Ligand SMILES: *[C@@H]1O[C@H](CO)[C@@H](O)[C@H](O)[C@H]1NC(C)=O
């Protein structure tokens with residue numbers, strides 16, 4: 001698998017046209033806070049195609 | 051008045067736009083900047 005190519009799997013809101021958010025902040029899916037570390041309701045926002 | 055800053059959080063988790071005017075040029079740049087706590091331009 002090539003792991004150099006990625007897509008964003010989760011976001012708080014959809015992009016506007018030609019908007020380009022490169023932020024790597026952990027996706028908080030629920031009431032559980034992330035505090036900069038992965039966990040329950042707290043997932044890395046990108047996936048790699050492989 | 052010698053420049054402007056635009057963005058969402060204005061800190062390294064986010065992209066932001068900087069305009070600086072230095073009287074020879076207008077310089078414009080878009081980065082995941084870290085801003086100072088009280089930004090300033092030189093005397
Ligand atoms: C733009 O940034 C704000 C920052 O609070 C965020 O709430 C909003 O969802 C963002 N909009 C888009 C379309 O990304």
Ligand SMILES: *[C@@H]1O[C@H](CO)[C@@H](O)[C@H](O)[C@H]1NC(C)=O
Pocket residue numbers: 022023024
């Ligand atoms: C370039 O942007 C990506 C995505 O935000 C980030 O992972 C990477 O650390 C940035 N490059 C540098 C030199 O920090």
Ligand SMILES: *[C@@H]1O[C@H](CO)[C@@H](O)[C@H](O)[C@H]1NC(C)=O
Pocket residue numbers: 072073074075077
């Ligand atoms: C204005 O900005 C440009 C950016 O390339 C630089 O070359 C130039 O020396 C600057 N002028 C002054 C007066 O700082």
